[PDB]
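Q&A FORM
Asked by: J.P.
Topic: structure of Neutral amino acid transporter B(0)

PROVIDED:
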Amino acid sequence: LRANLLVLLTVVAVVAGVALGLGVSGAGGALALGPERLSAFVFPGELLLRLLRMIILPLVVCSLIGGAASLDPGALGRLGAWALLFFLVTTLLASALGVGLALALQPGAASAASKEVLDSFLDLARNIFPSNLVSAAFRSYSTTYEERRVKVPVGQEVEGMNILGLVVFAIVFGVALRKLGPEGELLIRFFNSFNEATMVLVSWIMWYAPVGIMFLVAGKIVEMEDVGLLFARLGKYILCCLLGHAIHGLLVLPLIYFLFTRKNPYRFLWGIVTPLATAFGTSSSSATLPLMMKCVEENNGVAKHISRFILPIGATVNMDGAALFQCVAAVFIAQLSQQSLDFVKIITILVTATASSVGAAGIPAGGVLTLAIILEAVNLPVDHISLILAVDWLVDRSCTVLNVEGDALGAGLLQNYVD
Ligand code: NA
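REPLIED BY: S.T.
REPLY: Here is the structure written out as tokens.
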């Protein structure tokens, strides 16, 4: 079927990009290409990223408005509380697994290789309640410091979409529309139509996705000066990250799903393999959001009013893979600096990763800034982050799957809470 063809092409795009980038690097790489040729070579990946960033606003906002307006406020409140508990518990488990898998199997046992913590959470709270809806569509509040030599924190809005604030506003506005009654039907229909129109565009973009992924991966592995040396240096770190992701996705989340529902979790995952493949290929949660919702509603028995509400929220708040990656990177850096971590600092890492996972922006910087916040919370050198980013093109992808799987299973849990 053409859905299977698209999934196969999207997955094979990563392998083809890896091969193309290795060939280009072995044929001189960027120095042989030069800046002008390299920019054109990597441009298609940038085009794909721009296309994927375009859809996030209308898709998420309309989906959340519809999902919130399609449920009784009391039932919506109970469902949201349970979903938040599930997301927090899963993120905490991912962080704990990441820390445990790095203290053992030490990735940094070789010699080859800012905002205050309170101010970061105050900025998170400010972004949860945007001061302007139009501005929130492309800017987020951020605090810098001015010396008066007291470092007073002064804040301003800086580039970067405010997804968390818009999500909160969409949920509240949908609740208000539901409470209006027959007067709010027109707006519910309007936002549903907008959501369907946006999903059509997302489906069209999925066809160009493989070509963008090709050049994205090729350029991002051409930027590495030495593939062999870098991989020999970060082999154990990548092993820790991917092993933690595999353990969390294949053992922990399925175990929780079985314990609570007592149905087969792998039969559930078999119905969403296609969204998982799209997530791995594109590294975008919004890209798989429509396909994930379709598969969950059709292949699985999840009710529409459950999926349309839970999945858009999880795509923004549930970042198990990101938390695991951040904790593994923090332990790796702490081992590189030979700065022994005691129980207090381990708990600090866990709590900071869990708390900062909420509001992790969709941009690539959103998964590495939180790492800087964690390092500051524990007092680690940020200089080493250069290494961590160098393999994001792989690790981030592994994160994205774990960032969506936990969402789908989450819905699968709440369905049983409703049954
Ligand atoms: Na997610």
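FOLLOW-UP: The longest strand covers residues 139-147.
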